[PDB]
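Q: What does the assembly look like in three dimensions?
Context provided by user:
Components: two
Sequences:
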Amino acid sequence: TRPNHTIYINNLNEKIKKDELKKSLYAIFSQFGQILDILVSRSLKMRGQAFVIFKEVSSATNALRSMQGFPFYDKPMRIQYAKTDSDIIAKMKGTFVE
RNA sequence: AUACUUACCUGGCAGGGGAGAUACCAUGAUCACGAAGGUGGUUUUCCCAGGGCGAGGCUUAUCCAUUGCACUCCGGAUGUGC
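A: Here is the predicted structure of the complete assembly.
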């Protein structure tokens, strides 16, 4: 609930292949700012989810506000801030601990 | 259909890995203890050829499970090709 560089997206369509999903998330979410990375896995724990990492928290906050509920492959997107900093954010900060 | 008989038409030949090495066994080698080797085994190194076993992995769809906070791939099942 507290703003973050990374947004967490769930309720994604699980049928969509990994590169396609990264691709289509990039298209939609660059409109709000510079993206450092989009992480997708199709494993059991991680399917249906993506982390979009932005350079600025303000882009993240605007991306979260605007896209909340957005129809994406026949499913509304659920978006939150990530609970924890993404490794590349934390290393940028010197906050990083293994 | 099978076996033989006669007539007619036809008709090449040759083979089954190869090459090394073997200290050990057999061949109980005809000259005062002995050949070397060769041959046949055994073991082994090359040239390797066809099979056996299929651990693992690649690919794609049905069903089942999953609403999951990660940043070291990575749920289950079943089937065509690899």
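Follow-up: The longest strand of chain A covers residues 35-40.
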